[PDB]
Design a protein around this ligand. Structure first.
Ligand SMILES: Cc1cc2nc3c(=O)[nH]c(=O)nc-3n(C[C@H](O)[C@H](O)[C@H](O)COP(=O)(O)OP(=O)(O)OC[C@H]3O[C@@H](n4cnc5c(N)ncnc54)[C@H](O)[C@@H]3O)c2cc1C
Length: 459
């Protein structure tokens, strides 16, 4: 670990990598150090709940096959592209180094320095906090003791992919708690594995259907049927009361009286932004939405920026906000990098989200998407190209935010408009690809729409 580094990136995920790339692009000789608590070099997360499950050496290499059959590495860059932390301070033309297995435990804003868990002290000139978040657990699990806890997976990293993939091959029943996109993706991934093995997969949540807090009743229900068609036993309207061990089996007790016996549990119930450094750093966090509060240029302080899942930014349309989008991590990380190199540009990007439940069904979302808001959905029969696989064959990539582009324009599918009076504040696209720029334009203009069935023609 160097005693000093010009650019210090705390956390080694998607946002940090984007910032590292941006800093180097604007400053060819920049010296950038990434401190990552995890043992792995920077990698993208979407494949962990998708393509990596649709394949035995893949678990070792982590080089997956996209829906189009072509391989891609989960890592942002090959390990030989990074320089050693030891050489970073004076190596010719600089570079980007990564300190894996090390965690920043103290931040001293006034002295521009951080302390690592091993006692190491590092000063910086410009710092980016890109710590992401920590998965949330169920209070029922927290209050159940060590045994139950040891048999519950909080899905987020490469290590969770490997341990869960192992378990799916070794046990007879796995239960997923959570109806969100991630829980549903895992449900489909695990369901397919179970079909060949002849095992069981259960998914339960308090809502009436999958993604119930986001999707309107019609599409929420359609999604639940989709998951059931994969062999998964889906249990909606399920409120967990307690969880314990009975005769070596996990026993989940629900409020309506139902009891569920299973071998392992996977929880996908949201995340808690990692703002532990706010304590010693004396930085302000948002008690309502979570995360480090930053200004328009993503600054927490004159020389400290925040990007990705850990940032509570000011959405140009919605006010204080925090999101969990790959697109956001990439764009905000890139911007932070540019601002750390004298750009002084505001974050006005409208972050998009995407989810693939296999090669045949996908979703895209943007803006305020809440099922409690008044909505208007327009649907139609899907064509042969309206699916994630075709979209990937066309674009050559499975990372939707890449093929969709970051710009704004100048039944088996459909569009769902979320409204505020007659203005569209959010949009969900079901099996419609390469039209996000149109969605961004509609939301940005913020005009009132007398029809919408006319607007749907745009998609
Ligand atoms: C399984 C899965 C699937 C997903 N699929 C999609 C998808 O299809 N579409 C989409 O739009 N989004 C998706 N997302 C979400 C998207 O991946 C995230 O928004 C993005 O990864 C966040 O990046 P980040 O850099 O902000 O944080 P992270 O990638 O979470 O990483 C933060 C890093 O910093 C480390 N760290 C934390 N604290 C410290 C510390 N004190 N010192 C050192 N290191 C620290 C962490 O351990 C971690 O390595 C998915 C997420 C998961 C988990």
């Amino acid at each position: 670990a160097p005693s000093h580094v010009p650019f210090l990136l705390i956390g080694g995920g998607t946002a940090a990598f984007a910032a590292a790339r941006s800093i180097r692009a604007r400053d060819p000789g920049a010296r950038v150090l990434i401190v990552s608590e995890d043992p792995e070099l920077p990698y993208m997360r979407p494949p962990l709940s998708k393509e990596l499950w649709f394949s035995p050496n893949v678990t070792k290499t982590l080089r997956f096959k996209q829906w189009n059959g072509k391989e891609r590495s989960i890592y942002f860059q090959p390990p030989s592209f990074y320089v050693s932390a030891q050489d970073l301070p004076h190596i010719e033309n600089g570079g980007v180094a990564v300190l894996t297995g090390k965690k920043v435990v103290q931040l001293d804003v006034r002295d521009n320095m951080v302390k690592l868990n091993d006692g190491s002290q590092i000063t910086y000139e410009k710092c980016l906090i890109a710590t992401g978040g920590t998965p949330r657990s169920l209070s029922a699990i927290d209050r159940a003791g060590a045994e139950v806890k040891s048999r519950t997976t909080l899905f987020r990293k490469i290590g969770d992919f490997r341990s869960l993939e192992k378990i799916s091959r070794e046990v007879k029943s796995i239960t997923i708690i959570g109806g969100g996109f991630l829980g549903s993706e895992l449900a489909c991934a695990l369901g397919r594995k179970a079909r060949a093995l002849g095992t069981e997969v259960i998914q339960l949540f308090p809502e009436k259907g999958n993604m119930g807090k986001i999707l309107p009743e019609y599409l929420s229900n359609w999604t639940m049927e989709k998951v059931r068609r994969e062999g998964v036993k889906v249990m909606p309207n399920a409120i967990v009361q307690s969880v314990g061990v009975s005769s070596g089996k996990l026993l989940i007790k629900l409020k309506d009286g139902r009891k569920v016996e299973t071998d392992h549990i996977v929880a996908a119930v949201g995340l808690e932004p990692n703002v532990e450094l706010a304590k010693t750093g004396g930085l302000e966090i948002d008690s309502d939405f979570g995360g480090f509060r930053v200004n328009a240029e993503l600054q927490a302080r004159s020389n400290i920026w925040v990007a990705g899942d850990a940032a509570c930014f000011y959405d140009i349309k919605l006010g204080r906000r925090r999101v969990e989008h790959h697109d956001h991590a990439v764009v905000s990380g890139r911007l932070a990098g540019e601002n750390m190199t004298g750009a002084a540009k505001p974050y006005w990007h409208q972050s998009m989200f995407w989810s693939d439940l296999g090669p045949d069904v996908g979703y895209e979302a943007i803006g305020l998407v809440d099922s409690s808001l008044p909505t208007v959905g327009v649907f139609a029969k899907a064509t042969a190209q309206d699916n994630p696989k075709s979209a990937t064959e066309q674009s050559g990539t499975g990372i939707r935010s890449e093929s969709e582009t970051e710009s704004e324009a100048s039944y088996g599918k459909g569009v769902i408009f979320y409204l505020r009076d007659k203005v569209v504040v959010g949009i969900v696209l079901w099996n419609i690809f390469n039209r996000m720029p149109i969605a961004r334009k509609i939301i940005k203009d913020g005009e009132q729409h007398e029809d919408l069935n006319e607007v749907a023609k745009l998609f």
